[PDB]
Amino acid sequence: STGSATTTPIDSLDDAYITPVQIGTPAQTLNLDFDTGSSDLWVFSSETTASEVDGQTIYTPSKSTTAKLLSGATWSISYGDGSSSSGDVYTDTVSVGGLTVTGQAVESAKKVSSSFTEDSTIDGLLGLAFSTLNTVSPTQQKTFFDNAKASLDSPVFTADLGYHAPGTYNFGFIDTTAYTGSITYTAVSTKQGFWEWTSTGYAVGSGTFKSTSIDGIADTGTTLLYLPATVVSAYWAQVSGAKSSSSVGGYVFPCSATLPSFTFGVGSARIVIPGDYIDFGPISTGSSSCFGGIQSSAGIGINIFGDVALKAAFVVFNGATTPTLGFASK
C-alpha cells in the first residue's frame, strides 16, 4: 500500500504545516502537524478542557464506531518549545492520504498548553520519530508509520515541504518526479529516538564550503534551522545590521536586507537554502526588525534541521531495518 497527502503551511511564514488525517468511522478529518521529531499522535478532542479549545476541530471518540478506549493508558508530552499536552488514549482507524491503519493509538488531549490553544489551525500532532519516544503509559504505543510499515510497498515516507506553498507527505513510495538529480542517503542514529544524522558541513552564500561534522535531527515539527553558534554567527555576519537579541530571543536582521543562501552538506551532496527561506518577517507587527530563520542551538542540546532546511529538499525517511535519511534537491 501507499498513501499521499498534501501538507499546507498554516500561515504566510510557513510556521508549521498541516496535513488532513481521517480518524474514526465515519471519518473525522483533523488537520495534524506531522512531526518527525516526536512519536505521539494526539488530537484535540471532546475530552479537551473546554477553555483550552479555540477554533480547533476536535475528535469525538463516542461518535466513532471503531473507537475503543485503551484502558488505563495515559500520555503526557513536553516539546522543545515548552509547549505540552496530555490525556488518555483510544485506538481507532486512521488514514492518511489513502493509507489506512487500524488499531492506531489516538491520544486524546484532556489538557493542552496555551500555544496549542492559541493556534486554531493545528488540531493535533502526528509523530513520525521512532516509537521508542512514544509517551503512552503503561504500554508504549507505535507511531502511524511504524504500524503502517509492514503493509507499505517500501518502508519509507517522504517529506516534500513547500516554501510559501503546499507540499506532500508520501508513504510507501518515492516519487521520482518530485526531485532533481539523485537522492543522497546518509546514516541515521536512532539512539535518541530521532532521525539523527551528521551533515558534512556548510557554506554561507557564495562562500567556500566548510567541511565539518554537524550532528542533528531532521525535524518537520520545528520551524527553524538550529545550528551551532559558530555556524550561525558566520551566517549572520554576512547580513549588515544583523545581531543576536536576547530580548527578542535570537538573531534579528533589518527587514530591508537581502539574505544570503545557506548550504548544508549531505555526504558529498549539497542542499541550498535560498536566502528568502531564512526570513521570518517582522518581530512584531510593523517592525522593521525581522526574525532570522537560522538560530543557535546552544542550550537546546541538539542541532535541529527544521522546516527551513527540510523545505529546501526532498527528504526520504527510510525506515528499513537499518534506517537512513535521503536528501535531494528539488
mmCIF file of C-alpha atoms in Angstrom:
data_model
loop_
_atom_site.group_PDB
_atom_site.id
_atom_site.type_symbol
_atom_site.label_atom_id
_atom_site.label_comp_id
_atom_site.label_asym_id
_atom_site.label_seq_id
_atom_site.Cartn_x
_atom_site.Cartn_y
_atom_site.Cartn_z
ATOM 1 C CA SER A 1 0.000 0.000 0.000
ATOM 2 C CA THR A 2 0.872 3.663 -0.235
ATOM 3 C CA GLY A 3 -0.506 6.992 0.874
ATOM 4 C CA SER A 4 -0.074 10.532 -0.386
ATOM 5 C CA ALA A 5 -1.339 13.669 1.345
ATOM 6 C CA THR A 6 -0.846 17.340 0.728
ATOM 7 C CA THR A 7 0.649 19.367 3.545
ATOM 8 C CA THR A 8 -0.142 23.078 3.741
ATOM 9 C CA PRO A 9 1.576 25.927 5.594
ATOM 10 C CA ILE A 10 -0.538 27.245 8.463
ATOM 11 C CA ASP A 11 0.376 30.868 7.780
ATOM 12 C CA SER A 12 2.311 33.185 5.488
ATOM 13 C CA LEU A 13 5.592 32.417 7.265
ATOM 14 C CA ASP A 14 5.465 28.617 6.999
ATOM 15 C CA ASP A 15 5.485 28.431 10.795
ATOM 16 C CA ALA A 16 4.210 24.866 10.542
ATOM 17 C CA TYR A 17 2.414 22.607 8.099
ATOM 18 C CA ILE A 18 -0.875 20.788 8.465
ATOM 19 C CA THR A 19 -1.968 17.599 6.768
ATOM 20 C CA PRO A 20 -5.509 16.250 6.783
ATOM 21 C CA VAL A 21 -5.949 12.949 8.624
ATOM 22 C CA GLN A 22 -9.074 10.792 8.751
ATOM 23 C CA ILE A 23 -9.802 9.334 12.186
ATOM 24 C CA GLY A 24 -12.619 7.009 13.084
ATOM 25 C CA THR A 25 -15.773 5.712 11.461
ATOM 26 C CA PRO A 26 -17.371 7.662 9.904
ATOM 27 C CA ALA A 27 -14.208 9.628 9.249
ATOM 28 C CA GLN A 28 -13.486 12.696 11.312
ATOM 29 C CA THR A 29 -10.924 14.771 9.422
ATOM 30 C CA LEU A 30 -8.453 16.682 11.558
ATOM 31 C CA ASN A 31 -5.528 18.759 10.339
ATOM 32 C CA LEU A 32 -2.440 17.453 12.070
ATOM 33 C CA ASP A 33 1.122 18.676 12.300
ATOM 34 C CA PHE A 34 3.289 15.821 11.047
ATOM 35 C CA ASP A 35 6.272 15.831 13.339
ATOM 36 C CA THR A 36 9.363 13.755 12.634
ATOM 37 C CA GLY A 37 10.727 14.952 15.971
ATOM 38 C CA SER A 38 8.153 13.231 18.180
ATOM 39 C CA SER A 39 6.241 9.974 18.336
ATOM 40 C CA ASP A 40 2.741 10.641 19.648
ATOM 41 C CA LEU A 41 -0.385 11.027 17.540
ATOM 42 C CA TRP A 42 -2.517 13.289 19.700
ATOM 43 C CA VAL A 43 -5.614 15.298 18.956
ATOM 44 C CA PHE A 44 -7.857 17.960 20.295
ATOM 45 C CA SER A 45 -10.967 16.112 21.350
ATOM 46 C CA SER A 46 -14.342 16.158 23.020
ATOM 47 C CA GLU A 47 -12.334 15.470 26.209
ATOM 48 C CA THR A 48 -10.174 18.593 25.919
ATOM 49 C CA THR A 49 -10.780 21.162 28.653
ATOM 50 C CA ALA A 50 -13.286 23.486 27.004
ATOM 51 C CA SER A 51 -11.434 26.705 27.838
ATOM 52 C CA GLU A 52 -8.361 25.279 26.074
ATOM 53 C CA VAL A 53 -10.162 24.772 22.761
ATOM 54 C CA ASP A 54 -10.314 27.826 20.495
ATOM 55 C CA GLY A 55 -11.293 27.016 16.928
ATOM 56 C CA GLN A 56 -9.670 23.588 16.527
ATOM 57 C CA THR A 57 -11.544 20.690 15.044
ATOM 58 C CA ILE A 58 -11.996 18.005 17.680
ATOM 59 C CA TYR A 59 -12.072 14.233 17.567
ATOM 60 C CA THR A 60 -15.129 12.815 19.310
ATOM 61 C CA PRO A 61 -14.466 9.147 20.000
ATOM 62 C CA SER A 62 -18.054 8.480 21.094
ATOM 63 C CA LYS A 63 -19.124 9.239 17.504
ATOM 64 C CA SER A 64 -16.697 6.696 16.037
ATOM 65 C CA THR A 65 -17.972 3.132 15.823
ATOM 66 C CA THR A 66 -14.391 1.862 15.639
ATOM 67 C CA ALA A 67 -13.014 3.797 18.620
ATOM 68 C CA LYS A 68 -12.074 1.819 21.702
ATOM 69 C CA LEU A 69 -10.750 3.214 24.946
ATOM 70 C CA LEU A 70 -7.283 1.841 25.607
ATOM 71 C CA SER A 71 -7.965 1.051 29.203
ATOM 72 C CA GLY A 72 -5.655 2.582 31.755
ATOM 73 C CA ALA A 73 -3.466 4.307 29.188
ATOM 74 C CA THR A 74 -2.433 7.923 29.608
ATOM 75 C CA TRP A 75 0.033 10.179 27.863
ATOM 76 C CA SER A 76 1.852 13.395 28.568
ATOM 77 C CA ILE A 77 4.336 15.166 26.349
ATOM 78 C CA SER A 78 6.503 18.249 26.552
ATOM 79 C CA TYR A 79 8.094 19.718 23.450
ATOM 80 C CA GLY A 80 11.317 21.658 22.946
ATOM 81 C CA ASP A 81 9.471 24.965 22.688
ATOM 82 C CA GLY A 82 7.986 24.493 26.156
ATOM 83 C CA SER A 83 4.519 23.504 24.962
ATOM 84 C CA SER A 84 2.791 20.409 26.308
ATOM 85 C CA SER A 85 -0.330 18.290 26.262
ATOM 86 C CA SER A 86 -1.690 15.200 27.975
ATOM 87 C CA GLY A 87 -4.699 12.923 28.175
ATOM 88 C CA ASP A 88 -5.968 9.407 27.629
ATOM 89 C CA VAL A 89 -5.898 7.038 24.683
ATOM 90 C CA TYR A 90 -8.208 5.395 22.189
ATOM 91 C CA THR A 91 -7.444 3.028 19.389
ATOM 92 C CA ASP A 92 -9.169 3.804 16.121
ATOM 93 C CA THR A 93 -8.801 3.654 12.373
ATOM 94 C CA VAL A 94 -6.531 6.355 10.995
ATOM 95 C CA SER A 95 -5.999 7.123 7.327
ATOM 96 C CA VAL A 96 -3.518 9.475 5.703
ATOM 97 C CA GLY A 97 -3.769 10.152 2.014
ATOM 98 C CA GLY A 98 -5.500 6.842 1.340
ATOM 99 C CA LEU A 99 -3.257 4.724 3.604
ATOM 100 C CA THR A 100 -5.206 3.149 6.457
ATOM 101 C CA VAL A 101 -4.032 1.797 9.796
ATOM 102 C CA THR A 102 -6.471 0.010 12.052
ATOM 103 C CA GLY A 103 -5.919 -0.001 15.800
ATOM 104 C CA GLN A 104 -3.806 3.149 15.784
ATOM 105 C CA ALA A 105 -3.302 4.769 19.170
ATOM 106 C CA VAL A 106 -5.068 8.117 19.050
ATOM 107 C CA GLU A 107 -4.088 10.133 22.079
ATOM 108 C CA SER A 108 -6.988 12.297 23.163
ATOM 109 C CA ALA A 109 -5.989 15.534 24.844
ATOM 110 C CA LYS A 110 -7.561 16.413 28.147
ATOM 111 C CA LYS A 111 -5.168 19.342 28.569
ATOM 112 C CA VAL A 112 -3.101 21.393 26.156
ATOM 113 C CA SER A 113 -0.798 24.312 26.834
ATOM 114 C CA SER A 114 -1.542 27.821 25.725
ATOM 115 C CA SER A 115 0.463 27.750 22.485
ATOM 116 C CA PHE A 116 -1.715 24.902 21.223
ATOM 117 C CA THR A 117 -4.949 26.620 22.232
ATOM 118 C CA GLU A 118 -3.803 29.803 20.562
ATOM 119 C CA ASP A 119 -3.121 28.069 17.254
ATOM 120 C CA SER A 120 -6.539 27.398 15.790
ATOM 121 C CA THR A 121 -5.096 25.790 12.666
ATOM 122 C CA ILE A 122 -3.453 22.767 14.303
ATOM 123 C CA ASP A 123 -5.829 20.066 15.519
ATOM 124 C CA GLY A 124 -3.055 17.857 16.903
ATOM 125 C CA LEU A 125 0.249 16.220 16.060
ATOM 126 C CA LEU A 126 1.143 13.064 14.195
ATOM 127 C CA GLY A 127 4.528 11.861 15.362
ATOM 128 C CA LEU A 128 6.916 10.287 12.889
ATOM 129 C CA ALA A 129 10.038 9.842 15.020
ATOM 130 C CA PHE A 130 10.848 6.405 16.451
ATOM 131 C CA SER A 131 8.252 4.701 18.606
ATOM 132 C CA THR A 132 10.722 4.480 21.489
ATOM 133 C CA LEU A 133 9.830 8.141 22.187
ATOM 134 C CA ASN A 134 6.093 7.497 22.429
ATOM 135 C CA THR A 135 4.807 8.717 25.792
ATOM 136 C CA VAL A 136 1.844 6.398 26.352
ATOM 137 C CA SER A 137 1.961 4.684 29.722
ATOM 138 C CA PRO A 138 1.973 1.972 30.909
ATOM 139 C CA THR A 139 2.078 0.392 27.444
ATOM 140 C CA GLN A 140 4.051 2.381 24.892
ATOM 141 C CA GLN A 141 2.331 2.715 21.529
ATOM 142 C CA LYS A 142 3.546 2.703 17.950
ATOM 143 C CA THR A 143 3.541 5.579 15.503
ATOM 144 C CA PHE A 144 1.342 5.627 12.457
ATOM 145 C CA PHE A 145 4.384 4.889 10.292
ATOM 146 C CA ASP A 146 5.512 2.002 12.476
ATOM 147 C CA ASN A 147 2.023 0.485 12.297
ATOM 148 C CA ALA A 148 1.779 1.005 8.528
ATOM 149 C CA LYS A 149 5.289 -0.087 7.662
ATOM 150 C CA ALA A 150 4.794 -3.770 7.007
ATOM 151 C CA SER A 151 1.916 -3.019 4.635
ATOM 152 C CA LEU A 152 3.787 -0.369 2.665
ATOM 153 C CA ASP A 153 5.245 -1.096 -0.757
ATOM 154 C CA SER A 154 8.559 0.191 0.638
ATOM 155 C CA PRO A 155 9.181 1.015 4.314
ATOM 156 C CA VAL A 156 9.635 4.735 3.755
ATOM 157 C CA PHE A 157 7.927 8.055 3.949
ATOM 158 C CA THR A 158 8.962 11.281 2.292
ATOM 159 C CA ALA A 159 8.622 14.928 3.224
ATOM 160 C CA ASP A 160 8.399 17.476 0.444
ATOM 161 C CA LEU A 161 7.597 20.727 2.223
ATOM 162 C CA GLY A 162 6.819 23.826 0.199
ATOM 163 C CA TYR A 163 8.164 27.324 0.590
ATOM 164 C CA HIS A 164 5.099 29.512 0.991
ATOM 165 C CA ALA A 165 3.203 26.757 -0.851
ATOM 166 C CA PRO A 166 1.698 23.324 -0.253
ATOM 167 C CA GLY A 167 3.830 20.201 -0.409
ATOM 168 C CA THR A 168 3.431 16.483 0.089
ATOM 169 C CA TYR A 169 3.923 13.644 2.532
ATOM 170 C CA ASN A 170 4.107 10.266 0.798
ATOM 171 C CA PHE A 171 4.099 6.884 2.493
ATOM 172 C CA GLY A 172 5.441 3.719 0.936
ATOM 173 C CA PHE A 173 6.999 5.065 -2.247
ATOM 174 C CA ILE A 174 9.479 7.563 -3.574
ATOM 175 C CA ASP A 175 8.032 9.896 -6.199
ATOM 176 C CA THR A 176 10.892 10.146 -8.653
ATOM 177 C CA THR A 177 9.254 13.167 -10.317
ATOM 178 C CA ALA A 178 9.382 15.214 -7.111
ATOM 179 C CA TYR A 179 13.105 15.972 -7.026
ATOM 180 C CA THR A 180 16.008 16.789 -9.293
ATOM 181 C CA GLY A 181 19.269 14.892 -9.556
ATOM 182 C CA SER A 182 19.838 11.993 -7.213
ATOM 183 C CA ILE A 183 18.942 11.287 -3.610
ATOM 184 C CA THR A 184 21.956 11.121 -1.315
ATOM 185 C CA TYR A 185 21.466 8.803 1.605
ATOM 186 C CA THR A 186 23.177 9.244 4.937
ATOM 187 C CA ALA A 187 23.383 7.247 8.146
ATOM 188 C CA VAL A 188 20.905 7.649 10.981
ATOM 189 C CA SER A 189 21.351 7.052 14.681
ATOM 190 C CA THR A 190 18.152 6.070 16.447
ATOM 191 C CA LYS A 191 19.811 6.155 19.873
ATOM 192 C CA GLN A 192 17.883 9.254 20.969
ATOM 193 C CA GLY A 193 14.707 8.211 19.139
ATOM 194 C CA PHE A 194 15.137 10.827 16.414
ATOM 195 C CA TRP A 195 16.044 10.848 12.743
ATOM 196 C CA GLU A 196 19.520 11.891 13.795
ATOM 197 C CA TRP A 197 22.234 12.270 11.183
ATOM 198 C CA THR A 198 25.504 14.104 10.547
ATOM 199 C CA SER A 199 25.763 16.863 7.992
ATOM 200 C CA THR A 200 29.149 17.178 6.352
ATOM 201 C CA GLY A 201 29.367 20.965 6.577
ATOM 202 C CA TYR A 202 28.043 24.258 5.348
ATOM 203 C CA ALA A 203 28.537 27.335 3.225
ATOM 204 C CA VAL A 204 27.172 30.862 3.556
ATOM 205 C CA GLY A 205 26.036 32.478 0.326
ATOM 206 C CA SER A 206 28.634 32.079 -2.391
ATOM 207 C CA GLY A 207 31.311 31.389 0.220
ATOM 208 C CA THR A 208 33.567 28.380 0.375
ATOM 209 C CA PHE A 209 32.205 25.179 1.850
ATOM 210 C CA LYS A 210 33.409 24.391 5.362
ATOM 211 C CA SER A 211 33.813 20.676 5.914
ATOM 212 C CA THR A 212 32.728 19.949 9.454
ATOM 213 C CA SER A 213 30.514 17.314 11.048
ATOM 214 C CA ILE A 214 27.218 18.642 12.362
ATOM 215 C CA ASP A 215 25.086 16.088 14.173
ATOM 216 C CA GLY A 216 21.429 16.995 14.217
ATOM 217 C CA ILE A 217 17.884 15.818 13.705
ATOM 218 C CA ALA A 218 15.563 16.020 10.732
ATOM 219 C CA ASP A 219 12.530 17.546 12.426
ATOM 220 C CA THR A 220 9.500 18.573 10.405
ATOM 221 C CA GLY A 221 7.839 19.782 13.602
ATOM 222 C CA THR A 222 10.408 22.511 14.240
ATOM 223 C CA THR A 223 10.070 25.666 12.170
ATOM 224 C CA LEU A 224 13.646 26.920 12.077
ATOM 225 C CA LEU A 225 17.169 25.678 11.486
ATOM 226 C CA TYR A 226 19.100 25.456 14.759
ATOM 227 C CA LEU A 227 22.847 25.042 14.404
ATOM 228 C CA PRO A 228 25.990 25.571 16.466
ATOM 229 C CA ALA A 229 26.715 29.129 17.494
ATOM 230 C CA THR A 230 29.873 29.250 15.387
ATOM 231 C CA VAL A 231 27.950 28.375 12.217
ATOM 232 C CA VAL A 232 25.099 30.747 12.987
ATOM 233 C CA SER A 233 27.466 33.618 13.744
ATOM 234 C CA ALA A 234 29.227 33.025 10.440
ATOM 235 C CA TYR A 235 25.906 33.203 8.626
ATOM 236 C CA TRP A 236 24.593 36.375 10.240
ATOM 237 C CA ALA A 237 27.950 38.127 9.942
ATOM 238 C CA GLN A 238 27.154 38.319 6.215
ATOM 239 C CA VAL A 239 23.988 40.357 6.840
ATOM 240 C CA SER A 240 24.595 44.040 7.564
ATOM 241 C CA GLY A 241 22.942 45.066 10.782
ATOM 242 C CA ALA A 242 22.116 41.540 11.933
ATOM 243 C CA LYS A 243 22.557 40.855 15.633
ATOM 244 C CA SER A 244 21.593 38.440 18.326
ATOM 245 C CA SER A 245 18.916 39.968 20.511
ATOM 246 C CA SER A 246 18.428 38.491 23.971
ATOM 247 C CA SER A 247 15.172 40.436 24.309
ATOM 248 C CA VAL A 248 13.703 39.015 21.109
ATOM 249 C CA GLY A 249 15.211 35.561 21.611
ATOM 250 C CA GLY A 250 17.566 35.165 18.688
ATOM 251 C CA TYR A 251 19.141 36.710 15.658
ATOM 252 C CA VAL A 252 17.272 39.557 14.070
ATOM 253 C CA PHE A 253 18.135 41.498 10.971
ATOM 254 C CA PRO A 254 16.971 44.618 9.126
ATOM 255 C CA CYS A 255 13.885 43.763 7.139
ATOM 256 C CA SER A 256 15.444 45.755 4.275
ATOM 257 C CA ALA A 257 18.205 43.147 3.910
ATOM 258 C CA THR A 258 18.582 40.637 1.141
ATOM 259 C CA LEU A 259 19.629 37.416 2.889
ATOM 260 C CA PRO A 260 22.348 35.112 1.596
ATOM 261 C CA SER A 261 21.648 31.463 0.986
ATOM 262 C CA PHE A 262 22.828 28.751 3.334
ATOM 263 C CA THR A 263 24.155 25.431 2.080
ATOM 264 C CA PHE A 264 24.362 22.260 4.117
ATOM 265 C CA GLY A 265 26.202 19.074 3.223
ATOM 266 C CA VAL A 266 24.695 15.621 2.913
ATOM 267 C CA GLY A 267 27.651 13.383 2.233
ATOM 268 C CA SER A 268 29.288 14.842 -0.866
ATOM 269 C CA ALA A 269 25.991 16.450 -1.896
ATOM 270 C CA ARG A 270 24.814 19.953 -1.090
ATOM 271 C CA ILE A 271 21.370 21.352 -0.278
ATOM 272 C CA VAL A 272 20.978 25.077 -0.814
ATOM 273 C CA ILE A 273 18.509 27.005 1.318
ATOM 274 C CA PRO A 274 17.666 30.232 -0.535
ATOM 275 C CA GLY A 275 18.035 33.406 1.474
ATOM 276 C CA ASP A 276 14.339 34.164 1.325
ATOM 277 C CA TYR A 277 13.616 30.934 3.234
ATOM 278 C CA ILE A 278 15.534 32.404 6.183
ATOM 279 C CA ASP A 279 13.269 35.465 6.520
ATOM 280 C CA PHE A 280 10.649 35.081 9.246
ATOM 281 C CA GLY A 281 9.367 38.593 8.982
ATOM 282 C CA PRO A 282 8.884 41.421 11.444
ATOM 283 C CA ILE A 283 9.488 40.565 15.081
ATOM 284 C CA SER A 284 6.207 42.306 15.870
ATOM 285 C CA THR A 285 3.630 43.802 13.569
ATOM 286 C CA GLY A 286 5.003 46.845 11.741
ATOM 287 C CA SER A 287 8.564 46.430 12.974
ATOM 288 C CA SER A 288 11.487 46.855 10.594
ATOM 289 C CA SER A 289 13.438 44.259 12.573
ATOM 290 C CA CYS A 290 12.958 40.799 11.114
ATOM 291 C CA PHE A 291 13.432 37.430 12.777
ATOM 292 C CA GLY A 292 16.032 35.064 11.394
ATOM 293 C CA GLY A 293 15.340 31.528 10.272
ATOM 294 C CA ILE A 294 18.766 30.237 11.284
ATOM 295 C CA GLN A 295 19.289 30.334 15.027
ATOM 296 C CA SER A 296 21.737 28.972 17.556
ATOM 297 C CA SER A 297 21.155 25.551 19.041
ATOM 298 C CA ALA A 298 23.315 26.447 22.045
ATOM 299 C CA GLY A 299 21.355 25.443 25.118
ATOM 300 C CA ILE A 300 18.882 23.300 23.154
ATOM 301 C CA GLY A 301 21.385 20.494 23.427
ATOM 302 C CA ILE A 302 20.875 19.305 19.858
ATOM 303 C CA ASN A 303 21.066 20.733 16.357
ATOM 304 C CA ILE A 304 17.762 20.755 14.525
ATOM 305 C CA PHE A 305 17.264 20.635 10.784
ATOM 306 C CA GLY A 306 13.754 22.027 10.942
ATOM 307 C CA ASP A 307 11.447 23.188 8.209
ATOM 308 C CA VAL A 308 13.764 25.958 6.994
ATOM 309 C CA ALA A 309 16.262 23.290 5.989
ATOM 310 C CA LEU A 310 13.925 20.458 5.075
ATOM 311 C CA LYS A 311 11.741 22.517 2.746
ATOM 312 C CA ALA A 312 14.785 23.112 0.539
ATOM 313 C CA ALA A 313 14.934 19.356 -0.109
ATOM 314 C CA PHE A 314 13.010 16.237 -0.941
ATOM 315 C CA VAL A 315 13.619 14.147 2.173
ATOM 316 C CA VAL A 316 13.374 10.379 2.446
ATOM 317 C CA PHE A 317 12.797 8.875 5.872
ATOM 318 C CA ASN A 318 13.884 5.308 5.211
ATOM 319 C CA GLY A 319 12.501 3.035 7.918
ATOM 320 C CA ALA A 320 14.234 -0.116 6.734
ATOM 321 C CA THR A 321 15.765 -2.387 9.379
ATOM 322 C CA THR A 322 18.717 -0.006 9.436
ATOM 323 C CA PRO A 323 17.106 3.390 8.962
ATOM 324 C CA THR A 324 18.677 6.071 6.790
ATOM 325 C CA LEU A 325 17.823 9.549 5.544
ATOM 326 C CA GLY A 326 17.905 10.694 1.955
ATOM 327 C CA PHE A 327 18.099 14.238 0.629
ATOM 328 C CA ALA A 328 17.650 15.501 -2.899
ATOM 329 C CA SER A 329 17.437 18.966 -4.351
ATOM 330 C CA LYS A 330 14.116 19.860 -5.968
#
